[PDB]
């Protein structure tokens, strides 16, 4: 699930 900011 990490660590993610966008798309």
């Amino acid at each position: 699930f990490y660590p993610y900011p966008y798309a």
Partner: single-chain antibody, 241 residues
């Protein structure tokens, strides 16, 4: 323990050499947040260099820095690195690392910056389909107490599929690192006063300061992260007459 991003000290290097800048994170779970890096040539805007996901060690770069900058992480020491190779005078700038969150896709915590001077001296210290962010005015002189309004226009809608608009405002006080002010159009970040308010939609956005105070002076940057690559506006300097 409050979050802190602590970068390595100023560097003086010969053209052609390489430099490895560090960014030690503390106060949060290092592998749960993307670490982004930004370049700021003296007097110019912020440029996205690339991102690293500390959990996977996977990266993504701004096309122009791909092949120039190498982003790595050391999870044991909770430290991120950026190596720059074949340095020239055009690499002289301040580089920042900054934590990027998911909920806002914004840069909530910034390092203090690392000044790199590329020199033989012994002492001292494109377009494509990228979304373009245009800020107006370039400069806004006021008397303290005045209200202020600055605008930011994107070359295309920043409305995202999930219905959110990832348009944020940052404030960089003279000599300091940028700080997040407003994320996702109108949400005030922690500790940001009510005199600041963000509005707008699609491609048209505005930041308002009902009453300018001394601590508000500096350069305001809008940025979008709805589309990759991330892009920043050119900056609006708020200063006293």
């Amino acid at each position: 323990m409050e979050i802190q991003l602590q970068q390595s000290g100023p560097e003086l290097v010969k053209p052609g050499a390489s430099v490895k800048i560090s960014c030690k994170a503390s106060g949060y779970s290092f592998t749960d947040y993307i670490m982004l890096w930004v370049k700021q040539s003296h007097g110019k805007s912020l440029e996205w260099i690339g991102n690293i996901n500390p959990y996977y060690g996977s990266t993504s770069y701004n096309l122009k820095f791909k092949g120039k900058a190498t982003l790595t992480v050391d999870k044991s020491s909770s430290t991120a690195y950026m190596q720059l190779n074949s340095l020239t005078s055009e690499d002289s700038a301040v580089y920042y690392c900054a934590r990027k969150n998911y909920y806002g896709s914004s840069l909530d915590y910034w390092g203090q910056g690392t000044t790199l001077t590329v020199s033989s001296a012994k002492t001292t210290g494109g377009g494509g389909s990228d979304v373009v962010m245009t800020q107006t005015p370039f400069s806004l002189p006021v008397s303290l107490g005045d209200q202020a309004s600055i605008s930011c226009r994107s070359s295309q809608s920043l409305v995202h599929s999930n219905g959110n608009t990832y348009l944020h405002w940052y404030l960089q006080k003279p000599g300091q690192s940028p700080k997040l002010l407003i994320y996702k159009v109108s949400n005030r970040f922690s500790g940001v006063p009510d005199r600041f308010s963000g509005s707008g939609s699609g491609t048209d956005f505005t930041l308002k300061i009902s009453r300018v105070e001394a601590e508000d002076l500096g350069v305001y940057f809008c940025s979008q992260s709805t589309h990759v690559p991330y892009t920043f506006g050119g900056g609006t300097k708020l200063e006293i007459k």
